[PDB]
Amino acid sequence: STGSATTTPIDSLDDAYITPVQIGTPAQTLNLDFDTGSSDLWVFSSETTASEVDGQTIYTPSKSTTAKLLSGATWSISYGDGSSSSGDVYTDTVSVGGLTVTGQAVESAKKVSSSFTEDSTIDGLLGLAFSTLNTVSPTQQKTFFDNAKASLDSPVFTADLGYHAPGTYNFGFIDTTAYTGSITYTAVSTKQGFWEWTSTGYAVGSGTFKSTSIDGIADTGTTLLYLPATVVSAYWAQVSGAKSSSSVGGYVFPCSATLPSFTFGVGSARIVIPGDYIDFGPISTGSSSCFGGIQSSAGIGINIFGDVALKAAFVVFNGATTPTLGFASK
């Protein structure tokens, strides 16, 4: 089997991407944030505290003839941005772009934190990291990809995120029309549950490439590119007036600037992030200070190849017995 679904930016900055997902019988369609940095499929629901729902579409298990309470199971998750959610668990039929999994764990939110409530465009998350990170207790549950894998034509999914435009998530096949050149594959460590790999270095603008190993994760659920302070300082030093602002929470730059590109290495290959992809707009409405899309990871504990980096590439998440990642230009 295969599946193919369009993913659409939630706003004019590409802060995140939503993909429609069918849950239950008859189908209830929710727009989920596909997140290769986590492993829970959770949704706003008829069980979510009413004051914490503000415009989202909810899953109502009682209206699904295929929903079944997973007795005794609870979940609770905290994300790198400080947001969180928790609840109980149903199993139900879940379809993405024509690919159907029966018996998928659908984690129903009883509580969500303020940032989820405040984002009316995201109805939940669909985790695509390794199932060892799934938070369901006392019986850990599998991700949608893990459940679908055996049925797929090939045990892969691909992320093709757009810049200020829709893109595609494909399951079970590699669309050879969606990228240019060849796909370069690179090793993955699953030891932390992430799609964790080692970039071979970077360049700033037209500058020379610096060969240096940068371990990090391919994370579709993180907006920006978080890299070591040395790398980030070298980038922003090429932008007149750019500075790190403790009060804003990262590097800012004059909105009048033209930003240089940023290149990262994948083995001997190179992915170029155009300068425009690094502009996240005014820090507050009407400000002439703009927020940078490359930020330091020094306070995180891990480097994160988030959407800023991934949307410059066609990315293969290869879930073969030994997983690997592939990157191509597009």
β-strand pairing of 225-227 with 289-292: unpaired
Angle formed at CA 276 by CA 270 and CA 277, multiple of 5 degrees:
60
Report the SS3 class of residue 232: helix
Task: Catalogue all structural domains in the chain, each as residue range(s) with its CATH number.
Answer: 5-174 (2.40.70.10), 175-330 (2.40.70.10)
Residue 137's nearest CA partner among 175, 87, 173 is: 87
The 3 state secondary structure assigned to 261-297 is: CEEEEECCEEEEECHHHHEEEECCCCCCEEEECEEEC
Please tell me the distance from the alpha carbon of residue 135 to that of residue 75, in angstroms, as a whole number: 5
Q: Is 213 a catalytic residue?
A: no
Q: What is the DSSP string of 58-87?
A: -B-GGG-TT-EEEEEEEEEEE-TTS-EEEE
Q: Render the burial of 190-202: b for 16+ CB within 10 Å, e for the rest.
A: eeebbbbbbbbeb
Solved using: X-ray
Q: The dihedral of CA 326, 200, 129, 110: what is its sign?
A: negative
Q: Is 279 a catalytic residue?
A: no
Report the SS3 class of residue 199: strand
Question: Which entry of 38, 95, 199, 296 is annotated as an active-site residue?
Answer: 199
The experimental resolution of this structure, in angstroms, equals: 1.1
Please tell me the distance from the alpha carbon of residue 94 to that of residue 104, in angstroms, as a whole number: 6
Please tell me the distance from the alpha carbon of residue 171 to that of residue 153, in angstroms, as a whole number: 9
Please tell me the distance from the alpha carbon of residue 264 to that of residue 214, in angstroms, as a whole number: 9
Question: Which entry of 33, 35, 40, 146 is annotated as an active-site residue?
Answer: 35
Residue 161's nearest CA partner among 310, 281, 27 is: 310
Please tell me the distance from the alpha carbon of residue 71 to that of residue 109, in angstroms, as a whole number: 15
Helix (H) or strand (E) holding 101: strand 99-112
Q: DSSP state, 149?
A: G
Please tell me the distance from the alpha carbon of residue 165 to that of residue 171, in angstroms, as a whole number: 20
Residue 89's nearest CA partner among 72, 65, 112 is: 72
